[PDB]
């Protein structure tokens, strides 16, 4: 019962964000890498556009493939 | 990479590298797709700069130009 | 393979949270001074080799073995 009341059941932190603030925070930790950052910004666009509706929310599942020193 | 390796070895404001020098370090001392080897070479420059400081001294910036790279 | 479990302990940027399977807590191994030993590089996997700084010990000449045998 102590495990069963401490995993989170329906408690979440907000998902609709300012887009340009997220863009500036992403651009100050890594150089380049435009495909990953555009994936994140398209996700936040979908989150902003859908907040009034009642549809199936499903978070992405990604794999990042590359040589051994790039910033995965 | 270079601000981190200069700050982390106490030589901040005492040593500096040029752009031709960074390009020579990339082309002649590194064969990688990632960026870890470049960080190790620039860290080697900063350690040897600290060693040279601790036995002599100078004032202002010492600028490492592209023809000073085989010294380090 | 335990070579794939050594990627977590020898990661220079990430080994301050090394998680053992016995202790369920993150443990900091980032002040430890790791020294490793090999006699060829070819049988080390490439992502594990890309974490370590390589120093080569070439082999002694005759004038060096002379002095080692006299003094030691």
Cβ–Cβ contact B57 with A under 8 A: no
Give the phi and the psi of residue A31 in degrees, each rounded to 5: -95, 140
Tokens, residue B10: 């106490």
DSSP per residue, A12-43? -------HHHHHHHHTTT-S--HHHHHHHHHH
Can you read off the two tokens belonging to residue B28?
């002649």
Which chain A residue is nearest to residue B39, measuring alpha carbons? A69
Would you say the C-alpha torsion A9, A15, A21, A23 has a positive or negative sign?
A: positive
Please say whether the beta carbons of B38 and B1 come within 8 A: yes
Output the CA–CA distances (angstroms, integers) from residue A51 to A27, B41, B53, B72, in the order listed. 26, 49, 59, 58
Cβ-Cβ contacts under 8 Å for A69 (sequence gap 6 or more): B32, B33, B34, B35, B36, B37, C50
Method in brief: cryo-EM
- Between vectors from CA B64 to CA B52 and to CA B36, what angle results, nearest 5°? 90
How many other CB atoms are found less than 10 A from the CB of residue B70?
A: 8
Q: What is the DSSP string of chain C?
A: --TTTHHHHS-TTTTTSEE-SSS-SEE--SS-------S-STTS-HHHHTTS---------HHHHHHHHHH-
User: Is there a binding annotation on residue C51?
Assistant: no
* A66 lies within 8 A of chain C by CB: no
**Domains of chain B as residue ranges with CATH:** 1-72 (1.10.8.60)
The nearest CA of chain A is from the CA of C12 a distance in Å of: 12
Chain A CB contacts of C50 below 8 Å: 68-69
Give bridge partners of residue B64 from the DSSP assignment: B17
Separation of CA C55 from chain center: 10
Query: Is C46 assigned a ligand-binding role in the annotation?
Result: yes
Q: How many CB atoms lie within 10 A of CB A1?
A: 5
- Contact between A67 and B33 using a beta-carbon 8 Å cutoff: yes
Q: Which of B8, B40, B42, B45 to mutate to test the interface with C (most CBs of C within 10 A)?
A: B40
CB-CB under 8 Å, A67 with B36: no
For this experimental structure, what is the resolution in angstroms? 2.4
Helices (H), chain B: 2-7, 19-28, 36-55
């Amino acid at each position: 019962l102590d495990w069963l009341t401490e995993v989170p059941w329906s408690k979440a932190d907000p998902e609709v964000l300012d887009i340009n603030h997220t863009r500036q925070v992403l651009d100050e930790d890594h150089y380049g890498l435009k495909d990953v950052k555009e994936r994140i910004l398209e996700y936040l666009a979908v989150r902003q556009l859908t907040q009034g509706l009642d549809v199936r929310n499903k978070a992405p599942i990604l794999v990042l493939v590359g040589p051994p020193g790039v910033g995965k | 990479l270079w601000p981190k390796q200069v700050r982390e070895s106490g030589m901040e404001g005492r040593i500096e590298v040029t752009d031709a020098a960074i390009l020579r370090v990339i082309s002649e001392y590194t064969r990688e797709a990632g960026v870890r080897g470049l960080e190790r070479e620039l860290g080697k420059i900063a350690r040897k700069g600290a060693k040279f400081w601790l036995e002599g001294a100078w004032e202002g910036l010492r600028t490492i130009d592209a023809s000073d790279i085989p010294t380090y | 393979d335990p070579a794939s479990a050594m990627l977590e302990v020898l990661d220079p940027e990430q080994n301050n949270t090394f998680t053992d399977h016995y202790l369920d807590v993150p443990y900091d191994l980032s002040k430890v001074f790791f020294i490793t030993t090999a006699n060829t590089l070819q049988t080390i996997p490439r992502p594990l080799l890309d974490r370590m700084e390589v120093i080569e010990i070439p082999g002694y000449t005759n004038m060096e073995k002379q002095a080692i045998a006299r003094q030691y």
